[PDB]
Design a protein around this ligand. Structure first.
Ligand SMILES: [Cl-]
Ligand SMILES: [Cu+2]
Ligand SMILES: [Zn+2]
Length: 105
């Protein structure tokens, strides 16, 4: 696969370090819709609102299987580490028009 999962379940956003690579979700937007990172970088999504959100990479994107992330409640977070250069689109399962992209060089 082209990424690994530090934590299979969501965790408390307060645990994320300042200066960690963070994508906020709010007002039905990934606050950084095209994120540029390097191989080995760990990306953390944080849900800032009461509507639950996830990140969903369809089959083909990070491997032959889809990576459907767990639903994050308000102030919950979820990380992925990108291990291979490429460009990876994702969306939120229940809200397919909430979408983003990670560019890994
Ligand atoms: Cl499916
Ligand atoms: Cu959503
Ligand atoms: Zn809904």
């Amino acid at each position: 696969d082209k990424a690994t999962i530090p934590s299979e379940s969501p965790f408390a956003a307060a645990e994320v370090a300042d200066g960690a690579i963070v994508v906020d979700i709010a007002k039905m937007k990934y606050e950084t819709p095209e994120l540029h990172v390097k191989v080995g970088d760990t990306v953390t999504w944080i849900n800032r609102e009461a509507m639950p959100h996830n990140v969903h990479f369809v089959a083909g994107v990070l491997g032959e299987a889809a990576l459907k992330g767990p639903m994050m409640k308000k102030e919950q977070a979820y990380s992925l580490t990108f291990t291979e250069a490429g460009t990876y689109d994702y969306h939120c399962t229940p809200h397919p028009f909430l979408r983003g992209k990670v560019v890994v060089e």
